[PDB]
Amino acid sequence: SGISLDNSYKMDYPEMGLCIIINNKNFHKSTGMTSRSGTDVDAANLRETFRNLKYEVRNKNDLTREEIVELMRDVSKEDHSKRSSFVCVLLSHGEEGIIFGTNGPVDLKKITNFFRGDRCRSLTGKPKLFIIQACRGTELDCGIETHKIPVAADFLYAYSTAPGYYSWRNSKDGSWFIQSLCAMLKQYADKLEFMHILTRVNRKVATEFESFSFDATFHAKKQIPCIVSMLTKELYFYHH
C-alpha cells in the first residue's frame, strides 16, 4: 500500500470500550459530607453522551471506598483486547489527589494504578481517560473582568478544576464542568480531536459560569478546568 501515518490512536477496534460512571450522591452521615444535589443530572447526561459515542456504559451509584477499589480492580482484570479505549468518570467530593467513597477517601493513584501499562496489558498502548468532577482543595477563583513504553503513558485526566481549587456544582443544572463537557462532546466529537474538544470545554466553563451566593465568601467566583495529558497520540472518537 501507500504511505501510512500513525499520529492517532486506533479507534476502530470492534468496541469503543467501557465507560464506567461512579456517581456518589449520598454519603454516610459519620463522614460529615453533604448530599451532592444535581449529580444525577450529570450522571444521566454522561450516560447518554457516551452511549452515543458507542461506549458500553456502566453506571454505579453511592459506592463505598472499598466498592470503588474492588470495582476498578475487577474492571482492570477484564479482557479489553477488542476495545479501543477506556473511560472512567468520577463524580464525588474530593481533595487534591483524592475522591470520596460514601464512607471515606480513595487515593486517585490507587484507582488509576490498576490500569498502568504493565498492570492492564489489554489496555497497553490504548487511551485511558479519567474524568473527575470533584474538588481539588478549597481555593476560590475571584476572576478578572475583561521497545518499552512508560507504564504511566496513555493516560488522560480531565479535571473539572485547577489544582488546589474548589469545583462548582449546580443543584438544578448539574456541575459546570460535566454539563459543558457533554455539550462539547455532543457538538464536536465527530469533528475535533479530543484535546481540542476539552479546550472548548475549558472556554465554556471559564466564560459562561459564575457562582451566585448570599455568602460573600462564595459569591461571584469562577472556574477553569484542567486537562492533564500523558497521551502519546491524537484521539478522535470517530474513524475512517
Binding site: 467530593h93 470533584a134 474538588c135 469545583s167 456544582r169 449546580n170 443543584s171 456541575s175 451566593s213 462564595f218
Partner: peptide, 4 residues
C-alpha cells in the same frame, strides 16, 4: 451553586 454548591462546591464539591
Amino acid at each position: 451553586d454548591e462546591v464539591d
